[PDB]
A paper describes a structure:
Driven by the hypothesis that additional DUBs may contribute to the modulation of the ubiquitin network by L. pneumophila, we performed bioinformatic analyses of Dot/Icm substrates to identify proteins of potential DUB activity. This exercise led to the identification of Lem27 (Lpg2529) which harbors a motif distantly similar to members of the OTU superfamily of DUBs. Our results demonstrate that Lem27 displays a broader activity toward ubiquitin chain types with a distinct preference for K6-, K11- and K48-type polyubiquitin chains. Structural analysis reveals that Lem27 harbors an OTU1 fold and that it recognizes ubiquitin via interactions mediated by at least six contact sites. We also provide evidence to show that Lem27 coordinates with the SidC family E3 ligases to regulate protein ubiquitination on the surface of bacterial phagosomes.
Upon subjecting the complex formed by selenomethionine-labeled Lem271-417 and Ub-PA to crystallization screening, we obtained crystals and solved the structure to a resolution of 2.43 Å by single-wavelength anomalous diffraction (SAD) phasing. There are two copies of the Lem271-417-Ub-PA complex in an asymmetric unit (ASU). The two DUB modules of Lem271-417 molecules in an ASU are almost identical with a root-mean-square deviation (RMSD) of 0.249 Å over Cα atoms of 407 residues (residues 1–417), except that there is an approximate 35o rotation of a domain consisting of a bundle of four α-helices (α-bundles) formed by α13-α16 spanning residues 315–417. The Lem271-417 molecule is composed of two distinct domains: a DUB domain spanning the first ~300 amino acids (residues 1–314) and a separate domain consisting of the four α-bundles (residues 315–417). The DUB module with a bilobal architecture assumes the shape of the right hand with one of the lobes giving the appearance of the thumb and forefinger and the other lobe as palm plus the three other fingers. The ubiquitin moiety is being held tightly by the open hand with its carboxyl end being inserted into the catalytic cleft to access the side chain of Cys24. A vinylthioether bond is installed between the side chain of Cys24 from Lem271-417 and the propargylamide reactive end of Ub-PA. In the structure, His304 is found within 3.8 Å of the S-atom of the catalytic Cys which most likely would constitute the key Cys-His catalytic dyad for Lem27. Interestingly, when compared with these OTU-domain containing structures, the finger lobe of Lem271-417 (residues 108–221) appears as an insertion domain (residues 108–221), absent in structures of OTU DUBs of eukaryotic origin. Inspection of the Lem271-417-Ub-PA complex reveals that the DUB domain makes extensive contacts with the distal ubiquitin moiety in the S1 site of Lem27 by multiple pairs of hydrogen bonds with a total buried conserved surface area of approximately 1900 Å2.
Author numbering:
A (entry chain A): 11 to 417
B (entry chain B): 10 to 416
C (entry chain C), D (entry chain D): 1 to 75
The structure:
Amino acid sequence: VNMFNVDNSGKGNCLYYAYSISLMYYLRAKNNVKITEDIFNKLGLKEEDRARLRKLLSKDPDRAFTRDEIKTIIEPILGRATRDLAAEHTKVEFKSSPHDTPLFSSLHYAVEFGFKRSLQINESELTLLIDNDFSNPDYTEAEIYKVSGLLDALQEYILTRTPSVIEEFNRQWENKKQELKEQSLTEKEIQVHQATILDNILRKETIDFLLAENEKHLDEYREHLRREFVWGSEETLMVLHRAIQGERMVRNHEGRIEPVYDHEIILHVHRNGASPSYQAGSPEMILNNEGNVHWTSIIPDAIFTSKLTDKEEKLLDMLERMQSEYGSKELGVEKYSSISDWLSDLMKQIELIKTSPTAVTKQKEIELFFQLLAKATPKLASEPALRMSLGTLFSNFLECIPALMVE
Amino acid sequence: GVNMFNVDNSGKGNCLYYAYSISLMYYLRAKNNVKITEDIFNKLGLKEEDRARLRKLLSKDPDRAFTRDEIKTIIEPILGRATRDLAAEHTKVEFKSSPHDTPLFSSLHYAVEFGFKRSLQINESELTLLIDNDFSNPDYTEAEIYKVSGLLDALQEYILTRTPSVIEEFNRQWENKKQELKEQSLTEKEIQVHQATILDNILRKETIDFLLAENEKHLDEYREHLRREFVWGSEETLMVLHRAIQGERMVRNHEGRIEPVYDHEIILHVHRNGASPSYQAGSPEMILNNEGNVHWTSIIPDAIFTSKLTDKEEKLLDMLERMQSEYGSKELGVEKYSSISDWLSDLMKQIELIKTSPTAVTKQKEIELFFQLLAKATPKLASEPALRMSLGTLFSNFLECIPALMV
Amino acid sequence: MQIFVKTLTGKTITLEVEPSDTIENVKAKIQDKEGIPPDQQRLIFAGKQLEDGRTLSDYNIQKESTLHLVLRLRG
Amino acid sequence: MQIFVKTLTGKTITLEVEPSDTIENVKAKIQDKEGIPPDQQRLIFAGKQLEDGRTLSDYNIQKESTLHLVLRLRG
């Protein structure tokens, strides 16, 4: 049950490495070439990078990506591309509609708290209309508060703008009082009307702070998210997935807003290996968080399944590369003229071990395998590099013996 | 009204150290002891010119609070950096004295034990079972060490590197302990406790070795992180700092028992959002108040300071001093007074002459002279909107302390 | 009236609500589009402490506002 | 055996304990010298979750170890 798991090198780039690996497995399963190129367009990939990734997506869908393929092509190309896209679409969403943004909803908590404190230092009774002691962790652990110096700048901004807030509040309540001339307001009712007016002023204050001096602080958040090795949080993993799918909120014939996608991809988030307790979809991408310090990739069974262990994949990939490096050489032994025909026969013999039914039959395929290794030994140790290749090949084999012995 | 005197600071990121220094300067003036004052100055490494400025501030009438200008131009520039330096440096001093006793070690080891659990399992070692740790305890994860940029990245590469040697070191020591318990028949329960202890002790040295390795690279990173301008101070470093300021030393005895020894004992308390602790401790000499995990301020105990101005009087002085730095340099060509600051200086002296004047008849004539000082500057200070309003606000403040001034 | 919420699945869903709906009913509707039980939802909007028993109109939440589900996970 | 703990008052105190003493007993001893009631003590040592019901010897807390009271306050 969605139990593959694939790690990454992450030196702080884990979210984006893990997203990239999860995505490339998805893109290969969804064999569609217009999905693949559309995602590449969103990521702004240049053509030589697209060529390298397309060659990886051509790989046999029943064989996993190797550790070297992940470390040398997938993480260097897509790690930066997804990080860039997530930081940039964070700003895009804010410019599109600032109030709908996680940045606004999370930073506004500090803004309201600060205005409570600043209003009280300024001896204004508006400080009473706010309840906020800046203790709610649902807000305080957002990424915006981990930006260096941001709360310092937010405090001098709020101290700057408090008197204008007081005057603007008075303006709108004078207008609201005269709009409610003919109604008889209880003092609790007047307090709800006032708290609402102050609320709306403060909401614009949060957005204006981010936008001030041509979007200085908004840009600081983008550049923070974009800095190499900065730890990704799930807020921006989520911005990133909205961007990759091409999600747009669009108004329709009746005037109702509904989400529109270019390419829908079902994403789930797991914690410490555990799937959610509740029933959602059959996911196409799964990202796994480990103890709030690391991110990894869980590959759904419907999206790829190989019947080799990661050690078994390592052994067979190494044999295929031995077959490409030495295969043309001569191996004057028996029927085998090539070393490549010998290596192919090694590959088939290892699979015959894997599929052999019981321990007694596995033992005889193991015996035939050692005799295959024996047949080539006279000629294969009078070659320098290939004797070294035989040794590592053998140790790789020993590493998959626990897996091979299961049948 | 047990302790309601609050004194703020300008803190941009330096609230802690500003607040500590203000709290300390009020203490040193209250304890008019010249060798307590000079020993703390020596601990802070102050040069003689800075000691001179601070000693002149300690000369101030003990019944008058320090003004914002004294605080902003004398106390925080000198003592803010000095206390920050001492707090960062004594953190390393304590670590070099006895690393296991330090808050740095006790807090960072949590991540070290967690990481070694994960790496041991990546290495398919059963030692991963001897650890219970999911890095979820906020008592540890909120330590300052985890806010140092990249430290956990570096810790992750150290742990993954050092895991095989840890496994081999465990095996040697467990072999030795089995041969030491040859003659006993240990259950599965006892053997697991023995193994956990051996691994525990090895991992503890791993934490110290990480900090000490490569000429104390990571230990120095923590010291300079704490020392960087505007970095938010945590209460861990407040306590390190107060240990340093008091000259606390843990010293061993004739009988061999350790007891704390101080140069100068000072009772420090920490308040949260203005509220004293629910429980009864001492009557404190310094109080540091934390506000919503974003600001630090200074509460002055009544036993240390008492102002004998009514607050109507204190507001009038503060407003005059704040006229003096905002407008003081502007020209006011009126008789002696060239600057507006020359005029404000004489206004301040005239209010003190009113207060100390002996009877109501003599007070009335000092009040009359105060009005003639206002008369001399009114033409030119009503020749400007902002200064006209300040002259008006000054006049209203003065009228409100007339009942206090007439006593 | 419509309101929006960003999911834990990299998408945005829409809810039909009234200003008088309690936060509890909003969470029930979220449970009815996502899978999350209400007591597992960490619901966020404009720094407000959305108490289960108080209402959208108590929090000055107007039409087409966007709330956010958070896990506050890092790595 | 002696044990040490860093206070919330910028000092260090010492306790006399035995390896069999529980964390609960240590917290009561801390209440004796400081003022903190046990349920307000956030006590930490070498990454160990000091559960009230387990003992110093359970956590391999040896002679002259230093524990720490924390408030985790910032500014």
